[PDB]
Amino acid sequence: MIHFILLFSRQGKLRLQKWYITLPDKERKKITREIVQIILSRGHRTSSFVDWKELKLVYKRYASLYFCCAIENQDNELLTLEIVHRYVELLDKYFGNVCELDIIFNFEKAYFILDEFIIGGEIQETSKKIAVKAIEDSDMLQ
Amino acid sequence: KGENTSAAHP
Amino acid sequence: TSYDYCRVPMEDG
Amino acid sequence: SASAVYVLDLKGKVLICRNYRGDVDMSEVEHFMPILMEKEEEGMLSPILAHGGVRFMWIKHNNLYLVATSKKNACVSLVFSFLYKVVQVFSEYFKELEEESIRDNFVIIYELLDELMDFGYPQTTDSKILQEYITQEAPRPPATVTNAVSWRSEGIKYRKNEVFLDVIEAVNLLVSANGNVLRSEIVGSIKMRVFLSGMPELRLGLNDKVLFDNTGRGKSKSVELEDVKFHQCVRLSRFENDRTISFIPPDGEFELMSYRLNTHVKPLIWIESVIEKHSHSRIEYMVKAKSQFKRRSTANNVEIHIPVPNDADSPKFKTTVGSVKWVPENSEIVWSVKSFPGGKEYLMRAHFGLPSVEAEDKEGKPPISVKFEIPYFTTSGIQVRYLKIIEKSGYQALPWVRYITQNGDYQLRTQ
Amino acid sequence: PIRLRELIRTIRTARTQAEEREMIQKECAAIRSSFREEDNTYRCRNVAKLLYMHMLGYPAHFGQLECLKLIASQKFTDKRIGYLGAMLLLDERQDVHLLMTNCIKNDLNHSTQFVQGLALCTLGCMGSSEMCRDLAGEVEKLLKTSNSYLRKKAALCAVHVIRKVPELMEMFLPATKNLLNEKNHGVLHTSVVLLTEMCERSPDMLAHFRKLVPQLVRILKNLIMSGYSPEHDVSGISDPFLQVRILRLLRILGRNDDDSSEAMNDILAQVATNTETSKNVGNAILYETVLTIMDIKSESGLRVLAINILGRFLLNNDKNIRYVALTSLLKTVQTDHNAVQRHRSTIVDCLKDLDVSIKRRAMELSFALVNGNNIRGMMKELLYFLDSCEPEFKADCASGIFLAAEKYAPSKRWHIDTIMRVLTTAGSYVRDDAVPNLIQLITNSVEMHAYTVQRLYKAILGDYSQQPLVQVAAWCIGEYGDLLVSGQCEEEEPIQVTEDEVLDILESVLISNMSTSVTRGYALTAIMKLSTRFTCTVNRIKKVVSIYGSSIDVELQQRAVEYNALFKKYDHMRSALLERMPVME
Amino acid sequence: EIFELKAELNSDKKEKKKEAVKKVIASMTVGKDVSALFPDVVNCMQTDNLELKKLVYLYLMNYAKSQPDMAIMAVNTFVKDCEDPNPLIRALAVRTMGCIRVDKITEYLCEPLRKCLKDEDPYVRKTAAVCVAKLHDINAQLVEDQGFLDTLKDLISDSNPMVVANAVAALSEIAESHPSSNLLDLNPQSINKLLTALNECTEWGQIFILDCLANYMPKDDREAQSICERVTPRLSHANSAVVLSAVKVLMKFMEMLSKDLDYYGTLLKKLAPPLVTLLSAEPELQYVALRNINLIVQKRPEILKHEMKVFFVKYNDPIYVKLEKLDIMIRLASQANIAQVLAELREYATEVDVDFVRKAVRAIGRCAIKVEQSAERCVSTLLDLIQTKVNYVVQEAIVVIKDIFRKYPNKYESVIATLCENLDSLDEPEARAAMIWIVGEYAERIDNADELLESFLEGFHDKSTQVQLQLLTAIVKLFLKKPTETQELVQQVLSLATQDSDNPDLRDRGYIYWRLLSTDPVAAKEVVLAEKPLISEETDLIEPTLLDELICYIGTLASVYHKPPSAFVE
Amino acid sequence: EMRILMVGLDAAGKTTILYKLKLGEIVTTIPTIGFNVETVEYKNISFTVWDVGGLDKIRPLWRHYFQNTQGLIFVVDSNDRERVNEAREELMRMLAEDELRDAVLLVFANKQDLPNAMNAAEITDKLGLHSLRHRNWYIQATCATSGDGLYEGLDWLSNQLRN
Ligand SMILES: Nc1nc2c(ncn2[C@@H]2O[C@H](COP(=O)(O)OP(=O)(O)OP(=O)(O)O)[C@@H](O)[C@H]2O)c(=O)[nH]1
Ligand SMILES: [Mg+2]
């Protein structure tokens, strides 16, 4: 079970937060600032795995913008990386050569790709075509 | 800048 | 300096 | 006694760096901003940070951290006052002090930091004499650099000879929420603009209570100088002897004396207000502003700030005299009266809204601070008596003065 | 009423946060005075700018009324941004989120599958258990339909309402029956996640769901033998997401069954060979395969190949796969305890890795690797590793050495030797909870307290800043000073136990501010203990109690008064109650 | 890329090598590794340009350590440039030679430094005086071998007191670096020469020549008064650093004055308005100023015992000043200023800074401890702050009212009738156990003391050691106060403490209380109900032997930290 | 433009009134946990009517809509004499606040079909509406299934909008 989804820049600026566990905003800032401090203070041959507070945390560096999640520590761990890679391909297919400013200016569309890809922490569409087709159909409703 | 790079490079 | 000045006596002996 | 004087940006990389002794390694500046955030988020935000055995003395500019590092027991106020003098000299040089001045005018600033300090020792930190041999537009150093009188170089000549005196009042006040005065002190500061020729010597005449007690004229109107701190140029031994302000003036703009006294006279602008803090609806500021001083002076450009709730909405101001701009960026109002005479009372009635849902945290209750400015008026009643120009040539300079009443931290506590 | 992206550019043109908060509060007051006019046209971008403020972390608590109003709107984009604001600004503890019930309920009965998609989305992401009890009758109704855009959302929304109300899962048992041939793999993925959740919750559901094992065996065989699909496909596998979920449902089912575990035997034997260890995805498939093998009661011949797989996973230079192999051998500790023990040199070799996680998992794997035979040689390198650790590893290692020594100690002398070596080399990094455990085991020892407390006094003479060390040592001195100072009532030939520095070391702990005042509680307790254990040098500790009667701590003042009354008034009652404390378990 | 810059450097045009070395120091400005371009900018150093050579000296300073072997190619150029008609380039080369810390270089750097000591212009003389201390920092015994100490004493014997003041700064540094072998204390005639040097040298030099006075102690009443009469006008200076060192030497030298003479009270009354005026400085100096005020009001509390109104905090003040003004108000809380201080602290719990409010409540507690007169007004104010029912405010006020009850337990028996209802869902174990002491200690005017502990005895086995032990003491005290009602309560807490708990001191006190209750429970009326003495509180006055050492360090890092200097230096 | 709140007890037919005033008929109505809002144009005045669900646990959250309120709908059930005391307690809880201080009151006595249902007068005197002050109150007994007096109440409310 994915407890949260975090997207933070290299400088530490929060670009996307998501909470699949309802913890309050002071706890949100505490946990978010802690995770931002942890991942930015770790090297480049460290497996992209952190055991942080009963969570086998799954992050990944794709660019200066860093991505972060944490699956429940009883599941497979590499599939969370495949989830993040699939969502990268979702942003690339709906946005088109997805820039940082595409994530900056059009963040709500990335939130909606996340909504039509994962609710509750789990994958709701495994097709890389049906999900982007459905969000382009919902955009076609406008 | 360093922001205009696309992520996945399809 | 829109506020104008005032002249003092120089010696005050 | 600092081994390396540093200036960082707001992120923590080196804008400019200047080592002196090698006691602090150059790589130890990289720990400063993590230690800054580490001590800051726990309430241990101090001007002295530490990394094992290396200290971090710092003052803070708007965009600049003047980091001053030492390892042994440095003389601390030496270091901090030199940081302030570096700020003042660079503000004299670069009127805005930003990263565009550091990263582009880097030809002169390393020379400045080499000249102002050697081995961690400040040697010659005056701006005007440093102008005369450190330029961005070189000859021998002046003898005024080596002189005992190191604030006024010979060779200065003007056509007219004018001495401008600025007696600037600053009323410090902290009135409690009950309506009594907790502290009514006045920090007065005289700043002079002297345009004379050569090496003059100036004796300031003031209506001191202590000096009139030394004279025997202590029954007329006088000022009770509780404390005065002078410039370096004033011969302080002679002032200790017979209250004599004897000084060779520096050239141009300079602050002569920074005096401080206590004043049991009523405050200039009294602020009474009631606040009807209803739950989740609104707020009301029935604020009145009366002036207790005489009916002849008019307070220019006052800015009576009342701190407001942070998430207020639909602002309303039933005013009588004076405009309001609501400033939610600072979460306050600015009740601006341009012409505010003495002896008059101007009412203001404010009305806001308030969101139906409460906030997670509290907001705090900041006091009321106003921004009055009164010309031709001194609340202390201090008056300059004379100013004798002494010159080997011999002439008539023009000692001019104006009286200005401003505020310092003019606080009145809220409910 | 500026645009959202206009506020984005406004905040990105701010350098200092002391100015960026000013730029926040300007447009925030603009939004606030806009919400006083009850405008329903710019309310989309006003709430969007407010959510952009919440995303960076600015006060946006006030703009939840207008989120509910956007959900209570009628246009599609307004409802879209309203459900976004409901998932971002509202949670369980918001206390105002109970008004979404009627609006999501009417939008679960909305004609469009996308508006019902949003009503399922917000309820699945943050639907409270009180909202689960109010909406789960309509969640199953959107599972009683067959719209493949809606069934995938309704299945994970059912997972959510089980997650918040686990006593409401009985009404989804008749709703989940025999939808397990749906061709849409997204709906099939959410259904396998739902079955994994239902099998995780109740054993009463296992018997209904271990019957449909061969159906999903056929589904997984159809997905493994699927050579290619246009969608669902990363690294040449037709939907490996659903493959891992089916293997996980195979992992939790048959874990104590034999019939279903052999019903899944041949597909595991296939996918152990029809995976590919080249990219990340096939290594994930094969690791979930080996987890499914090691968690069911499988054939041990499968486990021969699976331990061959994990021995390959140790050999892979990817730190991903090294983390996976350490987690692998950390999972199959008790299952196949023999064949993991021959990976021991590799497990110890992974302790010198340059990662916090790999050192942590190899440390815990060497901890779980301890048996009744490897206790001698492994603990030497483990304590060498603790000596070569980092201060974040020292608490976990100091606990794990103690936990693996309390089980498999070959000699109680050497047990306390390893414990005392850890208490020297860790000091103020071991948890204080292990201190009564060490106290309980050394009082479970009965024949060696001379060798205990003499070595205690030999170590603690140099140090007292190691706080749990003296937490042990004060009780040790107070209970076994008679074995420490032995036969020395008066001055004799000089033996290193001296019964004057024995009290002075505790007194020096007392005077020194390197003392957590339960150091001082233990120490004064030891002082009052050693008035009967020692008849050698008495009426000097009574001086310490009498001068200690005005100390600044509360309990230590109480303790000094309650001692001094006994030491001055009821000396006949002191030796009556100073028997050793009895041994519990 | 750097070969192009070296090709610009290896040309013969001034404008090419000038832009080359400007690109070098611009790469050094952002910190690029331009260390590889060392031995070729060494060649492009001896120029007639004076603006260019400052950049080169900057490079040589920033890369002296970087090329310890290639740096030998500059000594001839330094001894040439110390032989120039321009004194700016001579003193520039001298202050370059001092900051270059390479021991292979500084052997040949003794005699041109000696010559520039004996120069005519005071600029290069006061530069070379500091360069003597620079070399003594590099090699002290080479300076001792060359005898630069006597020349440093001869620049003390110089005119134009800037050279003298830099000589005093260098001597303070070198004698600090000494083991005090051949200590350089002066006769009072040279000290009066420094007094004549005081009204003439720089405001920075007026600090360092007051720093030599931290190493000298006068021997007479008239000698000390005679030098302090001209130390005295230094307090009216704009810079707070001259004032702070003058305050330091006056605190050092006021232990020689006759208190019965009227000059000592003259020193006392003329010192306090400068100390009040230094609070109007800019706030980073105000932090060290407040720490030094704390150092002074512990040494002499009679100075600022009438100035309380100025130590009130303001809203613009940062945390490191607002927390220290509270400590000064603690150090100056007296009998007559009780109302302003208590109403001021009453308006300090109304803040959003949590630690400031906690420190304010502790300040009210230390006020109730320090004076016995306004302990009751502290109790009333703290109960009205409990009436706020802010969680951390109550979590501090319970402990503070406890510590009031520990010192003064006498007439506070109707106060606890309100304290029974004090938000019993309090969470912090330092104040849970504090409230347990308040209940069990005062368990004769509290009638419902048994049933409130039923909440405290439910989740018993996982709270703390402190909270469980305070329960274990307070129930025994309660049962001794009432044997009828809590008969089951003391037995069940002994069963929870002795049998199932493995908390070792909790076990020991449980078996002790049980053996006391079984042996003679009536004797507990004398054993555990013994008359407690007046608790000697933790008086935080610094040791006067250490405080007099910290009189000798005012304005230092030890003055800030309130530590000995060797406790933190390395 | 007039912000209108429909408060009152549960099972009182406030949503029956709401969908009788909006669509004109009586639809199948679930127990409304959250809230409802429509805009009723009547006597060329758009009545923005915020129907609030009258369950027990939502009753603390009723203060969130008392802001910018211009007219009140207070629906009672006339078939529950045992629920008049909690309705009076909610009434005096709602009216004595600084927010919602200048808005007009219109109390609906719904479900006038049974002899248990009283007139406007007995429901008034059990509420005690004469003790009110600075409140432009008027009670009105209605029959929501036929729509009796609902549009007359909207007419009087449109009279209470303008002054
Ligand atoms: N005979 C008759 N019955 C009515 C009338 N008005 C409402 N009712 C009945 O009252 C019942 C409750 O009303 P509902 O509208 O369904 O629910 P509610 O009272 O609005 O309560 P909430 O849904 O919580 O807001 C309905 O089932 C109707 O049958 C009426 O005017 N005449
Ligand atoms: Mg209804």
Side-chain angles (χ1 to χ4, degrees), chain E residues 87-99:
Chain E
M87 292 182 286
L88 292 175
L89 285 168
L90 304 172
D91 59 350
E92 289 179 350
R93 64 188 71 195
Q94 189 63 41
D95 190 74
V96 302
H97 65 94
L98 273 301
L99 295 175

Side-chain angles (χ1 to χ4, degrees), chain E residues 194-249:
Chain E
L194 177 59
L195 290 178
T196 300
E197 183 71 28
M198 285 286 286
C199 291
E200 186 178 1
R201 294 288 179 183
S202 294
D204 294 332
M205 299 300 178
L206 290 175
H208 190 273
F209 290 157
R210 70 170 61 92
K211 293 177 182 179
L212 51 90
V213 169
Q215 186 179 9
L216 55 93
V217 167
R218 183 177 178 179
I219 296 166
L220 188 63
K221 183 171 70 176
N222 289 318
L223 291 172
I224 290 165
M225 291 180 182
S226 295
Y228 184 75
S229 295
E231 64 268 15
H232 302 290
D233 187 75
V234 173
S235 295
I237 298 175
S238 296
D239 198 357
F241 294 101
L242 177 54
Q243 289 184 355
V244 174
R245 299 291 183 178
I246 289 171
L247 288 172
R248 186 173 298 171
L249 184 58

Side-chain angles (χ1 to χ4, degrees), chain F residues 451-469:
Chain F
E451 64 185 4
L452 56 87
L453 293 175
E454 297 294 327
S455 176
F456 292 103
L457 263 289
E458 182 179 1
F460 179 72
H461 296 285
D462 53 352
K463 291 184 179 180
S464 176
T465 302
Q466 294 179 356
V467 180
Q468 296 176 358
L469 189 59

Side-chain angles (χ1 to χ4, degrees), chain G residues 10-16 29-32 53-55 110-111 113 143-145:
Chain G
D10 55 351
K14 55 174 75 171
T15 53
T16 306
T29 302
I30 53 95
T32 50
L55 274 303
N110 199 358
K111 300 176 72 175
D113 55 346
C143 298
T145 57

Side-chain angles (χ1 to χ4, degrees), chain E residues 277-294:
Chain E
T277 63
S278 65
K279 294 295 288 184
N280 199 5
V281 177
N283 286 113
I285 293 293
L286 182 56
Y287 167 62
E288 183 62 32
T289 296
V290 175
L291 289 174
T292 304
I293 291 170
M294 292 297 170

Side-chain angles (χ1 to χ4, degrees), chain A residues 25-83:
Chain A
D25 188 75
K26 185 260 290 180
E27 294 288 326
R28 288 178 182 176
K29 295 298 180 184
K30 185 262 292 177
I31 291 170
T32 303
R33 182 65 180 271
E34 283 176 350
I35 291 168
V36 167
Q37 186 177 2
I38 287 166
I39 296 171
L40 292 174
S41 300
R42 191 178 294 274
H44 296 88
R45 292 179 180 89
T46 61
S47 72
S48 295
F49 293 115
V50 175
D51 182 74
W52 179 72
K53 192 177 71 67
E54 293 180 353
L55 293 174
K56 295 183 176 68
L57 186 146
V58 176
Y59 68 96
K60 184 63 178 66
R61 178 176 187 272
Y62 291 97
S64 66
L65 179 61
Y66 292 176
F67 293 164
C68 179
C69 297
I71 197 66
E72 184 179 2
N73 55 2
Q74 69 179 1
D75 297 331
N76 193 355
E77 300 294 323
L78 306 170
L79 181 136
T80 311
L81 192 149
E82 192 178 4
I83 290 169

